[PDB]
Write a protein that binds this ligand. Structure first.
Ligand SMILES: [Zn+2]
Length: 127
């Protein structure tokens, strides 16, 4: 409806590649969980949303910020929404206002844990 449940596993994979946000939604929520066995310092996953153009810079800034900031730069204006960084058996939800999205743009979601973004990314589109 106006939410999606996403799992990030021990093989650096999200279980979706593409999220659609319905125009009727005023908020949208992502419920993130982490099946598998590995703790967050070795296989952490977050779900972070930006424009496609901003993805790399978000990722690089996160790398500079490190594990103790959950691999995101504090106050990064390019981050539309984000969960916290989670490890196995943990969960986190993020809810954001759909007014923050422009219609028909293919934003990207991804994990900013070192090395996860090229495998752990997808599109989000407001339709
Ligand atoms: Zn990850």
């Amino acid at each position: 409806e106006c939410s999606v449940d996403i799992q990030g596993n021990d093989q650096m994979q999200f279980n979706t590649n593409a999220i659609t946000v319905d125009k009727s939604c005023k908020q949208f929520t992502v419920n993130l969980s982490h099946p598998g066995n590995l703790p967050k310092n070795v296989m952490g996953h977050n779900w972070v949303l930006s424009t496609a153009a901003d993805m790399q810079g978000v990722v690089t800034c996160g790398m500079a910020s490190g594990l103790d900031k959950d691999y995101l730069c504090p106050d990064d204006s390019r981050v539309i929404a984000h969960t916290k960084l989670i490890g196995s058996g943990e969960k986190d939800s993020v809810t954001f206002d759909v007014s923050k999205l422009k219609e028909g743009e293919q934003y990207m979601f991804f994990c900013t844990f070192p090395g996860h973004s090229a495998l752990m990314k997808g599109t989000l589109t407001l339709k």
